[PDB]
Symmetry: C2
Subunit: 520 residues, 2 copies
């Protein structure tokens, strides 16, 4: 393998592009649009084949918990990021790794067909007329938050509903919805952001759910980003090992510290599930202010109103917003290639079509982890480039089919059977999976004997992307360094005004048990 | 006394108006503007002689912690309120007590002058031509968040600063300031609300302070409003009695639960002070997002930039906003009457000019308590109507002057010497002061041999306005009731989605864990005779 194709200059495109030149492959990037970023490049209109965002989106993951393993975000960056500002990182990245030269913009990939397999033929239209070409391998990075899902079938009377309705996709700005009566269906992270945003200047906003999530702020312990508090090796273990109830018993408590979810009305049904909680710093407040009313699932619609699953009714609702998420297709692909059946994607680790005989194509970024996607797709590409070169090997088709089932089977009893969780996956565990396959997973215990400082920090502290550039192939020296100095780059954009100026309670109770244990 | 004048149809006007008809006085209300509410009536332009608000203001006190003692907010109201919605309560109130008939709108009070004292002569212009009249007593309710303070003298180079600047007062909407570099001066509750609002669609927002407050969310324990968790008789006592540090040591911890204030950069200088913390549910987040940068005090301005007290500089700042608060005047009053000198208002309990020989005039609402103003001005008016009638008596001038000093002296060592705290006052303590004067303050000790349920609830639970309509004059039956059922009226607008599930096995955590540890101490304490 040498000549590699990457579909889209997404985040996933941009990192694979880079992970290629690192394994010395020579890649070609095809971008439908005129620029990089994919979803995170905000545009005012909703252009086809690209994922839209509303203008005000902020990331739900820390910069030091979601940068590429060898490229910390500038120290002067905020810890959570406007879409504006994330883009900037991406641009800074593609400048610093000269990845822009491999990109062909406004060239959309129409078909990816197998030649007599170990290569692929790829048709791509440009200005009207459509060239073809041949590649040894191909990495798909065309995203999956593009094709809206609106299950109107399950909302009867929608046919009768006068007034306006649309899908989260189509939203961009709140202006236009001044003082209207607005029903948003579902408790997406997006639904929440939307609800909140519209709620300010709107008559009323409702927000339907049967299930109703746990809501959680990006702020955590001592105002540090939640991901660095929650995503820590040691903690992940406890979540895995402890009896599921003991864990649920703990989520319940931790989650309710902010507010009683029963009272605010979004207490879940099955707390059994480790379903992704929504990340909105604004929602609980906006509920107190009465800007938003949470509500049970819509049962039926009328021309002006909505009946609900708990018998209540909401009169004169001017606007419905279906934040009912997206589905996904690969309209340029053998329909048997990315087989998606009975609430299960048959791809070895959300990546490799198992029925292939030469392992020369993989989907990157077709995954929804519980941490940042950016370090996941980086590792996804470290694995995949090395597979392509042969440095790494897949198992048998029958082994790969056994995994796929067993994974997705656990996945189900861990996040429920909804086709909005197909791609849900525990965060660290998966990073580890990918890192093992290329032997970049640090062996913490082994790091006890040498550098017990690191050993501790890696286990008990926050699990950064940096950790994975410690051992195995492609290392970064600034990895020990990055990890040790993250606190600095966190506080740097925060502690922006300075004063200049449990101390003895800690010394005492420790010594007082050093008195307990000694006087024997 | 009978014919009473109330200057302004503020909240203060509207409650006194009511407190009058309750003591059978016949009042006349003079309203500069065309409608009630004063500050809380949002209008698009900043109309003179009335306090302006930006359009998006939300009350920073609970509905059940800030309703009038005998008029709960409707159950279907949210717990914190848009200005839009608070007005509604006020309107509902003035309808239910027929207070609207006493109001003369678009009649502004030009002078209040003493006749041969025990009455007052009051000139009021209407449409052009200005009638005079006479009243036995007069209650001033013209507010004090109207006259902007902008100490430009202390911000040198402001003369040189090109680009735009103005005062909090004149703010209304954020649209217009898209992607600009905006410096707001001070950490007002307002500054914060403004900063936050502008910050969303702005290039950058900074926010200057030397001192820098504690920031606090309206959300508290178990998502209940902060005021009902903080303003509780029992707790107030601990704050009063415990060594001031022990109390500071406690505020510091409680406050930082949300976030480390050192790290976010608004750690205060003197934590010694029980200074009012800002109430913004948005500010800490908006700092994480980097929408707002906190900064030390401005030292100097240039045409395009700002130097700062810690040597830093911020280039290309398009807009300064002075959220540097308000002062206050009474332009229709004897200059000797409301004497305001050396960081001290000489009014007996922020109310009565002591040099008066007949006690026939009082200011209501010239006070900034640490809880809701609405129950304070209600009690302010219960005291005052009764003074006017003679049912209640002031002490001597020399006694009233001794209090005033002693109060304002404590006030200083409790909130610092800044002329932005003149009117600061502990919340419950003051409610008690006013209630005592008319003997409506419940005695709990007594109230423990009868209704120990109430006795507990009153002390340990949240100190509502309702409490004060339990004893003394003007009672409400729906007072025991209101208090007992408040949890309902709180949850009613919240718990709007409901599970339906008798939780034993799946989710009833500290139900049996409480049963166990209580029985396990019923084992601890008993097993001494075995
Ligand atoms: C509201 C929201 C918030 C999120 N927040 C976070 C967060 O805080 N942290 C985090 O880690 N993740 C987050 N994510 C997830 C993740 O970052 C995004 O899904 C991510 O942008 C996906 O990037 P991608 O490159 O895989 O897809 P995209 O960015 O959509 O890339 C698709 C690219 O492919 C191009 N394309 C499509 N079809 C073709 C074709 N035939 N030929 C050529 N080009 C084509 C498009 O033009 C586009 O440039 C969030 C997602 C959402 C919806
Ligand atoms: C931003 C902000 C938020 C606040 N939030 C809260 C809160 O959440 N909870 C709380 O308890 N308190 C709060 N307060 C404190 C308090 O509610 C307000 O200060 C409120 O204005 C008090 O009303 P008032 O009647 O004293 O004064 P105002 O409402 O200012 O009364 C002025 C009225 O008198 C009239 N008037 C003035 N001069 C004359 C004249 N010469 N003749 C006739 N009429 C005249 C005016 O036209 C107007 O009708 C807040 C204050 C501010 C600034």
């Amino acid at each position: 393998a040498k000549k590699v194709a990457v579909i889209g200059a997404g985040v996933s495109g941009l990192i694979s592009l880079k992970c290629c030149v690192d394994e010395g492959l020579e890649p070609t990037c095809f971008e439908r649009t005129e620029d990089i970023g994919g979803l995170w490049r905000f545009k005012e209109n909703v252009e086809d084949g690209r994922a839209s965002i509303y203008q005000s989106v902020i990331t739900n993951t820390s910069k030091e918990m979601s940068c590429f393993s060898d490229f910390p975000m500038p120290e002067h960056f905020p810890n959570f990021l406007h879409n504006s500002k994330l883009l900037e990182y991406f641009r800074i990245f593609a400048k610093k790794f000269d990845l822009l030269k491999y990109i062909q913009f406004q060239t959309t990939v129409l078909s990816v067909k197998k030649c007599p397999d170990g290569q692929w033929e790829i048709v791509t239209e440009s200005n009207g007329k459509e060239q073809s070409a041949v590649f040894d391998a191909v990495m798909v990075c065309s995203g999956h938050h593009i094709l809206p899902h609106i299950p109107l079938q399950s909302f009867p009377g929608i046919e009768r509903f006068k007034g306006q309705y649309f899908h989260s996709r189509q939203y961009k700005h709140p202006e236009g919805f001044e003082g209207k009566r607005i029903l948003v269906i579902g408790i997406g992270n997006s639904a929440s952001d939307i609800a909140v945003e519209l709620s300010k200047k709107a008559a009323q906003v409702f927000i339907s759910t049967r299930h109703g999530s746990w809501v959680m702020s990006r702020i955590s312990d001592d105002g540090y980003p939640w991901d660095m508090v929650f995503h820590t090796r040691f903690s992940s273990m406890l979540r895995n090992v402890l009896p599921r109830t003991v864990v649920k018993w703990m989520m319940e408590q931790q989650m309710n510290r902010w507010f009683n979810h029963e009272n605010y009305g979004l207490e879940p049904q099955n707390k059994y599930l480790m379903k992704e909680p929504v990340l909105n710093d604004d929602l609980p407040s906006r509920l107190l202010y009465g800007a938003i009313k949470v509500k049970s699932r819509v049962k039926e619609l009328t021309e002006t109103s909505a009946i609900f699953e708990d018998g209540t009714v909401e009169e004169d609702i001017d606007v419905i917003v279906f934040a009912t998420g997206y589905t996904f297709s690969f309209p340029f692909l053998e329909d048997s290639l990315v087989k998606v059946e009975n609430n299960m994607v048959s791809l070895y680790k959300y990546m490799f079509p198992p029925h292939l005989e030469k392992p020369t194509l993989a989907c990157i970024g077709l995954i929804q982890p519980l941490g940042s996607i950016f370090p996941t797709v980086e590792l996804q590409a470290r694995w995949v480039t090395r597979v392509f070169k042969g440095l790494c090997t897949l198992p048998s088709e029958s082994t790969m089919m056994a995994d796929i089932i067993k994974r997705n089977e656990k996945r189900i009893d861990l996040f429920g059977e909804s086709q909005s969780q197909i791609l849900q996956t525990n965060y660290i565990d998966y990073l580890d999976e990918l890192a093992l396959e290329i032997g970049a997973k640090p062996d913490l215990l082994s790091l006890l004997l040498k550098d017990p400082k690191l050993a501790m920090k890696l286990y008990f502290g926050p699990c950064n992307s940096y950790q994975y550039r410690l051992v195995g192939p492609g290392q970064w020296e600034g990895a020990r360094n990055a990890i040790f100095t993250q606190k600095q780059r966190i506080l740097k954009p925060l502690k922006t005004r300075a004063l200049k100026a449990l101390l003895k309670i800690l010394g005492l109770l420790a010594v007082v048990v050093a008195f307990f244990f000694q006087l024997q």
